[PDB]
Amino acid sequence: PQITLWQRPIVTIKVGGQLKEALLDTGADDTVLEDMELPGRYKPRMIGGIGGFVKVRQYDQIPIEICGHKVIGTVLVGPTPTNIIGRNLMTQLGCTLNF
Amino acid sequence: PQITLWQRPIVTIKVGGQLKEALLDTGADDTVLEDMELPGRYKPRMIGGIGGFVKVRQYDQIPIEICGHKVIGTVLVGPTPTNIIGRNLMTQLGCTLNF
Ligand SMILES: COc1ccc(S(=O)(=O)N(CC(C)C)C[C@@H](O)[C@H](Cc2ccccc2)NC(=O)O[C@H]2CO[C@H]3O[C@@H]4OCC[C@@H]4[C@H]32)cc1
């Protein structure tokens, strides 16, 4: 894919049979998904943004398909305004920024 | 250039006569800079991120050079933890996400 930025770079993702929308986000170190149920034991964490910090549950080794491409890695779950794919997963996609 | 996402995509910018480091942020609609003065009038604006909303100052049609490219547009100034370059300016560079 080549994704221009006139619109939000929202892609379709597949999380265990659920399809969702998520923002491809180079400004995010990590992937944060809106509150949902994931497998495994989780570490509560603090994650900070524009408007301060929110608490998230960190889950490891979560299979996600982004854009038809399979990735497996860490996903943070909490009160985010939108699902965001962070660099930890965009590197698995092999995303680069180009200009 | 082709920018990798192994590291934060930080670039040097020049705005208001000042050199700054900023994060190239495809998940950011708008460009948001830590508190500084600009030689233009502004209006208040509420901008919402992962922790919620913050009040910013909105300066319109602000020239910025990014990696030696001259761009112009809206710059928001306020209590952001990091300088971020949003889509409003990256579209002017011809920035695409590629994978
Ligand atoms: C270490 O792990 C992390 C740590 C932090 C974050 S983050 O979401 O807070 N963020 C980091 C940055 C502030 C240093 C990534 C950004 O891409 C967020 C991601 C984001 C998007 C939407 C909502 C909340 C967050 N964008 C954002 O806050 O943009 C603001 C400014 O312009 C508007 O575009 C967006 O779209 C409309 C509102 C926002 C506005 C993610 C993973």
Q: What is the dihedral of CA B54, A79, A16, A26, to 10 degrees?
A: 30
Could you please state the CATH topology (level 3) that the domain comprising B1-99 is classified under.
Cathepsin D, subunit A; domain 1 (2.40.70)
- Would you call B27 and A23 a contact, using CB atoms and an 8 Å cutoff? yes
Of A1, A27, A90, the CB nearest to B23: A27
Question: H-type helices in chain B, by residue range?
Answer: 87-93
Residues of B in contact with A52 (CB under 8 A): 51-52
Q: Which residues, including other chains, have CB under 8 Å from residue A38's CB and lie 6 or more apart?
A: A57, A59, A62, A75, A77
- What 3-state DSSP class applies to A93? helix
CB B79 within 8 A of CB B97: no
State whether the beta carbon of A28 lies less than 6 angstroms from ligand 1: yes
Strand ranges in chain A using DSSP code E only, listed in sequence order:
2-4, 10-15, 18-24, 32-33, 43-49, 52-66, 69-77, 84-85, 96-98
Number of neighbouring beta carbons within 10 Å of residue A34? 14
Separation of alpha carbons A47 and B59, rounded Å: 29
CB B53 within 8 A of CB A53: no
Strand-pair partners of B84: B23, B32
Active site residue B25: yes
State whether the beta carbon of A71 lies less than 6 angstroms from ligand 1: no
Fill in the DSSP letter of residue B93: H
Separation of alpha carbons A85 and A65, rounded Å: 11
Of B26, B50, B97, the CB nearest to A50: B50
Q: What is the dihedral of CA A32, A54, B96, B34, to 10 degrees?
A: -170
Burial class (CB in 10 A: 0-12, 13-18, 19+), A42: middle
Burial class (CB in 10 A: 0-12, 13-18, 19+), B59: buried
- What 3-state DSSP class applies to A87? helix
Residue B50 — φ and ψ, nearest 5°?
A: -60, -35
Q: Indicate which technique resolved this structure.
A: X-ray
Residue B94 — φ and ψ, nearest 5°?
A: 80, 25
Alpha-carbon Rg for chain A, nearest whole angstrom, is 13
Per-residue tokens: A83: 């699902």
Q: What is the CA angle A47-A94-A88, rounded to 5?
A: 15
Q: Which residues, including other chains, have CB under 8 Å from residue B56's CB and lie 6 or more apart?
A: B32, B44, B45, B46, B47, B76, B77, B78, B79, B80
